[PDB]
Design a protein around this ligand. Structure first.
Ligand SMILES: [K+]
Ligand SMILES: [K+]
Ligand SMILES: [K+]
Ligand SMILES: [K+]
Ligand SMILES: [K+]
Ligand SMILES: [K+]
Ligand SMILES: [K+]
Ligand SMILES: [K+]
Ligand SMILES: [K+]
Ligand SMILES: [Mg+2]
Ligand SMILES: [Mg+2]
Ligand SMILES: [Mg+2]
Ligand SMILES: [Mg+2]
Ligand SMILES: [Mg+2]
Ligand SMILES: [Mg+2]
Ligand SMILES: [Mg+2]
Ligand SMILES: [Mg+2]
Ligand SMILES: [Mg+2]
Ligand SMILES: [Mg+2]
Ligand SMILES: [Mg+2]
Ligand SMILES: [Mg+2]
Ligand SMILES: [Mg+2]
Ligand SMILES: [Mg+2]
Ligand SMILES: [Mg+2]
Ligand SMILES: [Mg+2]
Ligand SMILES: [Mg+2]
Ligand SMILES: [Mg+2]
Ligand SMILES: [Zn+2]
Lengths: 115, 183, 177, 60, 84, 59
RNA sequence: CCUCCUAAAGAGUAACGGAGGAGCACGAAGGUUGGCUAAUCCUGGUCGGACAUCAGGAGGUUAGUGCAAUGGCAUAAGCCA
RNA sequence: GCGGGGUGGAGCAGCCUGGUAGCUCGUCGGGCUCAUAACCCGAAGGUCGUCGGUUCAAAUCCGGCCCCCGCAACCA
RNA sequence: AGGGCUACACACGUGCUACAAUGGCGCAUACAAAGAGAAGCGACCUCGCGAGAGCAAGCGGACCUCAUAAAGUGCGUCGUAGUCCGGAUUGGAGUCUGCAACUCGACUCCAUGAAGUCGGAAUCGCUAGUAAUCGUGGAUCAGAAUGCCACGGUGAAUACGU
């Protein structure tokens, strides 16, 4: 139930429950379950403690949760401190990957700010 | 005064000739230091001429003050109001180009289009001096968009520039100037 | 009393050696541990205060005292004498048992725990820290959590300075960063 | 301690994944199973560039 | 990005300038228009004036800039906000 | 004095103009100085310096 | 009607003199027994911020008194049971 | 001397009885229209004249100061 | 040569993708038309999770290649959740074209996981193989379509009447 410092859902299938970890998607969830030798359709509640321990051991091989968050923060901070074009885009909160700003860009710019 | 002007112009002419000769000598002798010195002298002389030209451009009393620009539509009607809006945009763009700061004190927009009138404050160095010569009526000729037939129509708009003069300091009456009678 | 015996048998000796104390009575002691929940959002619903008090009672094994406003404050819309918090004071056996629980179970369960700050000493040797989610205590059942509660934990110590306080806490392998 | 007002407080066994078992008094009746403890947590255990990457990825 | 099999790209004139600057130990900024050139480790500590379109912005190369194009440190568009 | 200024102002109407902007012929001419240009778009966008400097130089 | 000054170190003392309050409240806010001590600031602390609750320190009544002002109040007259 | 007032851009409420700013027009955005008005659908805008006090807390209670109103200003 | 045409408080038009269960996902398995190809289409085989890479047939084509159509059908799962809906955004690692992917290409992998739960006033298209929905091709083109041009699959409702 408690993996990588967080609680995973108990009533879901194992793959969906493992996706709740920050840094684990469907592909990594399948990889973890395959390396732990557990069927994906088995609910988390229907697992012995040793199986959960094996799941924790398998998850330990990936950079997840706070480690991943601080890695991402370090990368973004490095860009912003370098002051490259991507860093400036991150500073000003505009799309970083060359998307149009004349219209759209609402995900980066937040809700519309009337003049 | 005549000596200031005449000596300034004679020193300008003589210093230009001297700078030309020194530049010829520097370019011939490939002296980088003399070249840089001549460049500095030319820059100083250019600044001197620019300053004199500035005084000549703005001899007027209030040329250094900030100014107010009033734009009023005229004979064209709706076309005139659209033309007045165009003039307002033009003058705002020119002020931005010159670095002056503009604000809209007052404005009356035409119902169909454009503006009936607008009062704009322009603040900057010699703003009134730079803008005073734009006072007058501006005539516009084009195919009026407010004419179903698209006829070629003439429209008139007026720009008036006046300096911002500080309000007079009101002064209380000197008692020696008054005679008081009781009866 | 495992940690109390560990104190009396190892921490006293280590601190005496480190600080060259003449008398054992000069060795710092862990006087008390105070857990406090500021439940200032209970003015709208006193029942939230009751649930927070239940959480604190479960965490500490002790019925909490309800603390009310010392004086009326308009900024937070509180009148004098209005119940806006709860607290527990742990001394002796209960204090040591809670200290062991906190060190060995609760602190490891802190989400993304990177180490407690060693600058959180009050200038006299007492150490205050904050807990953001009571779920770090296994007594709190995850399935029965109504609201994300937090608290603050103050270890009041007879130490005369921050150096002595941090030495005493480190002697218990307190996870300073 | 006043009678009848405090939560029931009796000893239980907390067993962790790393084999650490500690018997401690607590309010919760059932014995505890821990995914992590102070004997195995990465921070407690202590187990918790551009030029290099360039020269590695562009080995000439 | 460019394929790893092709290796990093750098203009030949800029590469020669960087090599000459490193060998000679000169401290004059290297003026260049090659915004598309990759920053190489041997450039670290050099000042390179990269053309932004109308002027050469000085860039003091540090180890964190290695692997990026020189144009990433010379913004080409001027923007200070609307309604200013 | 303000009324004197207001009465001195020229009519915004036919026959009075310091400058003519004819877009069909794509010409702009200042009546006072005679300066004429063909870049009506630039002048409308704010290239008034030619006219202003000509007026100041004329004095 | 109450408090201070005028009022001249007992009382008292005027002016359309200088400043403020009252026309109630409380079955506890009264009696007794037992206990306790403030304002304010600083430091540390989840949300929590200038200001809530917690811990320590400095300070020593600069608080408090149901309501004006004066005189009192630590043996407290202040706070709790 | 005695009374009133001063609050989104304008005109009025909210004060009395402290906690909480409203109405009508106006402004702005989108509609309708060939276009404008009208009309329809949405928004925004006042920390309450100015200081001070009182209060846990003031548009509100108190006191100055400023402006505006009324009255009163007599026998003499 | 470098930069811009790709800016970005904002307003509008044309689209695409959704807001789920008449669906999402996984496995398996049916049925098209039309068209393009020589500095081209490129099979096969091998390597790579993948985009792709290496080697290398055939075809100026009813012959070879692009190139398994998808919706559908069968089984299983999800069980009404901002979800196993949505896939924007962003971090890292790559591929290909191209002298050269920073400004400013496409695509892949891992992570990420926004608004959105059917949209005010108002407004649009369509009368039958039509609307709706599902795939496929082409030109332009080194590379770069949610646009356009074209092709098939499934396949309605309603028209009292002026
Ligand atoms: K862009
Ligand atoms: K007296
Ligand atoms: K009592
Ligand atoms: K589109
Ligand atoms: K649309
Ligand atoms: K989701
Ligand atoms: K590009
Ligand atoms: K819609
Ligand atoms: K193409
Ligand atoms: Mg693009
Ligand atoms: Mg006396
Ligand atoms: Mg006396
Ligand atoms: Mg007497
Ligand atoms: Mg008398
Ligand atoms: Mg009393
Ligand atoms: Mg007593
Ligand atoms: Mg008493
Ligand atoms: Mg208020
Ligand atoms: Mg060019
Ligand atoms: Mg364009
Ligand atoms: Mg999905
Ligand atoms: Mg993904
Ligand atoms: Mg939402
Ligand atoms: Mg839903
Ligand atoms: Mg028809
Ligand atoms: Mg289609
Ligand atoms: Mg094609
Ligand atoms: Zn353990």
């Amino acid at each position: 139930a408690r993996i990588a410092g967080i609680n995973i859902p108990d009533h879901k299938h194992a793959v969906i429950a493992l996706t709740s970890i920050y840094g684990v998607g469907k592909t990594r969830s399948k990889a973890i379950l395959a390396a732990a030798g557990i069927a994906e359709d088995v609910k988390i509640s229907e697992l012995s403690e040793g199986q959960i321990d094996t799941l924790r051991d398998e998850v330990a091989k990936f950079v997840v949760e706070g480690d991943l968050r601080r890695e991402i923060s370090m990368s973004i901070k490095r860009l912003m401190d370098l002051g490259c074009y991507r860093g400036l885009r991150h500073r000003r909160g505009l799309p970083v990957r060359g998307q149009r700003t004349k219209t759209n860009a609402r995900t980066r710019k937040g809700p519309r700010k009337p003049i | 005064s005549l000596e200031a002007v005449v000596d300034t112009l004679d020193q300008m002419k003589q210093g230009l000739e001297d700078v030309s000769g020194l530049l010829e000598l520097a370019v011939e002798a490939d002296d980088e230091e003399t070249f840089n010195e001549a460049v500095a002298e030319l820059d100083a002389l250019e600044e001197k001429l620019a300053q004199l030209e500035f005084r000549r451009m703005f001899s007027g009393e209030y040329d250094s003050a900030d100014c107010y620009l009033d734009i009023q539509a005229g004979s064209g009607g709706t076309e005139a109001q659209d033309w007045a809006s165009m003039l307002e945009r033009m003058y705002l763009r020119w002020a931005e180009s010159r670095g002056f700061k503009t604000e809209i004190i007052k404005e009356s927009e035409g119902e169909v289009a454009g503006i009936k009138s607008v009062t704009i404050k322009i603040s900057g160095d010699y703003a009134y001096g730079w803008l005073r010569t734009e006072t007058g009526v501006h005539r516009l000729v084009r195919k009026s968009p407010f004419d179903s037939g698209g006829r070629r129509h003439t429209s008139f708009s007026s720009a008036f520039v006046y300096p911002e003069v500080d309000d007079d300091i009101d002064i209380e009456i000197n008692p020696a100037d008054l005679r008081i009678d009781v009866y | 009393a495992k940690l109390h015996d560990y104190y009396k048998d190892e921490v006293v000796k280590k601190l005496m050696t480190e600080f060259n104390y003449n008398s054992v009575m000069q060795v710092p002691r862990v006087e008390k541990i105070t857990l406090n929940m500021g439940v200032g959002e209970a003015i709208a619903d006193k029942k939230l205060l009751d649930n927070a008090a239940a959480d604190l009672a479960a965490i500490s094994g002790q019925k909490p005292l309800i603390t009310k406003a010392r004086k009326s404050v308009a900024g937070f819309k509180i009148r004098q004498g209005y119940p806006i918090g709860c607290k527990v004071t742990l001394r002796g056996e209960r204090m040591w048992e809670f200290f062991e629980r906190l060190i060995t179970i609760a602190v490891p369960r802190i989400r993304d725990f990177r180490g407690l700050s060693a600058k959180s000493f009050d200038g006299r040797g007492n150490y205050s820290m904050g807990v953001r989610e009571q779920i770090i205590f296994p007594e709190i059942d995850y399935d029965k959590v109504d609201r994300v509660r937090g608290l603050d934990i103050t270890i009041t110590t007879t130490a005369k300075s921050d150096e002595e306080g941090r030495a005493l806490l480190a002697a218990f392998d307190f996870p300073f960063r | 301690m006043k009678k009848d007002i405090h939560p029931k407080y009796e000893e239980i066994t907390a067993s962790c994944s790393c084999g650490n078992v500690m018997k401690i008094r607590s309010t919760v009746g059932h014995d505890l199973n821990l995914d992590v403890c102070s004997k195995c947590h990465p921070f407690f255990t202590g187990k918790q560039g551009r030029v290099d990457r360039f020269n590695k990825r562009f080995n000439i | 990005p460019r394929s790893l099999k092709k290796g990093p790209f750098i203009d030949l004139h800029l590469l020669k300038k960087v090599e000459k600057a490193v060998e000679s130990g000169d401290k004059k900024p290297l003026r260049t228009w090659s915004r598309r050139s990759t920053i190489f480790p041997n450039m670290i500590g050099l000042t390179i004036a990269v053309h932004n379109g109308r002027q050469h912005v000085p860039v003091f190369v540090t180890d964190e800039m290695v692997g990026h194009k020189l144009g990433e440190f010379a913004p080409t568009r001027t923007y200070r906000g609307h309604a200013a | 004095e303000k009324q004197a200024m207001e009465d001195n102002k020229s009519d915004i109407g036919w026959g009075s103009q310091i400058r003519s902007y004819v877009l069909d012929d794509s010409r702009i001419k200042d009546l006072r100085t005679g300066v004429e240009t063909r870049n009506t778009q630039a002048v409308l966008d704010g290239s008034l310096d030619q006219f202003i400097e000509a007026s100041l130089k004329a004095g």
